[PDB]
Write a protein that binds this ligand. Sequence first.
Ligand SMILES: Nc1nc2c(ncn2[C@@H]2O[C@H](CO)[C@@H](O)[C@H]2O)c(=O)[nH]1
Ligand code: NI
Ligand code: NI
Ligand code: NI
Length: 331
Amino acid sequence: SSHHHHHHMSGENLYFQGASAAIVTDTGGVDDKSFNQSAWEGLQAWGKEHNLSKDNGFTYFQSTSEADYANNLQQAAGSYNLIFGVGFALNNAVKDAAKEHTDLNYVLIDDVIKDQKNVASVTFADNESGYLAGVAAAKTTKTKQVGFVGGIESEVISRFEAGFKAGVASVDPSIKVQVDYAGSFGDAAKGKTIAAAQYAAGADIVYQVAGGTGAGVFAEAKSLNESRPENEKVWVIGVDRDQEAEGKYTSKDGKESNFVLVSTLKQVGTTVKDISNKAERGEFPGGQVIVYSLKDKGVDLAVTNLSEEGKKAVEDAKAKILDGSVKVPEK
Ligand SMILES: Nc1nc2c(ncn2[C@@H]2O[C@H](CO)[C@@H](O)[C@H]2O)c(=O)[nH]1
Ligand code: NI
Ligand code: NI
Ligand code: NI
């Protein structure tokens, strides 16, 4: 209201203490065009905003295996005071590291840690985005059969699967959803053989929810589509990022086209940048569980190459999820 006792201070003597933020990444890698890449793009954007460069204020530790999680988190604790575990698999390793270094701040993305003051947890309503992808798929199938390729069987991927199945059923319960898990988020070759089998059995759309494994699903669809006419093409649904650019191909008939129907979005990069800024300002949300959903645009659907009829079904289904009229199952 008033500040009568005051002293003039030079801007040269006032300074804001910066933080150093690192992500510890799973097998998928920061080049997975999806989940880990979104996180890494977010951290790079944050680095650029704070005048930093890789291994000088921000970095990523790629995990070779589960045994490398603890090694990478301990290496990170040498130089970084905000450490993100990217993926549900880092749950136990982040719990242990947070108990050893109570002075550092940790974030688990895609899972919850309870009762740890220096750990924040982030989850996404991927069931809600999955539902929208299902409505999209149900409005474009000609064969009335669609594929789902998961990475590792988990509460997280079951959220996508349940939402996707529910969204397909909301339009046409006649449609068959073939489900297959790769057992990995970093196995393109297994993604390719699963997609090959799903397409050969008469799926005309595959939704890939397996991070970097999904590069194989894109490779299979591209090979089938290059050896066919444009109007007989087979679709993939993108995940985490808008993957439209990965769908570029040329048909047997010489026509330039795109086989990405739609992508589910998961704003992991946005979350990494926002929490990094809060940690640097001394407002780290330790002990809290942050839930992103359709409402706050933490998840969404990019409607890329969907028919106008499909976009209407998606916009209508989105309204019903926001209003509460449709409750999307999580399992
Ligand atoms: N634990 C883990 N989950 C991943 C990874 N890549 C992708 N995912 C999950 O799979 C979904 C589809 O890529 C993402 O939204 C994440 O939930 C990874 O490397 N590790
Ligand atoms: Ni005042
Ligand atoms: Ni004074
Ligand atoms: Ni800074």
